[PDB]
Amino acid sequence: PLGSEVIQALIFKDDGSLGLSISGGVGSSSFKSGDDGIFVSKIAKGGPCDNEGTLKIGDKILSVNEISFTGITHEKAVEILKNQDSKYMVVVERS
């Protein structure tokens, strides 16, 4: 997208959670018109994502720990984000 920026955040799980919610994915209703991507749709107050402070509602997730989130389902996105790691390098596209 014109004027878009690519941002990265390193977030550590606390009690098994990153403190954010996702929407979208291939095979789901699109969060943004015409974009089947995975998007940050909620950030829990006082959670790890809020504390680190880099990510924002509306960010499109491009990768997590170098796993591409382009062309993946909501279900696959969730599996990855619920995996056994505690450390997540999240790359997003902000528009």
Binding site: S23, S29, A44, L81
Partner: peptide, 8 residues
């Protein structure tokens, strides 16, 4: 189409 929102 399904429109999930999942907390992680």
């Amino acid at each position: 189409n399904p429109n999930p929102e999942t907390s992680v």
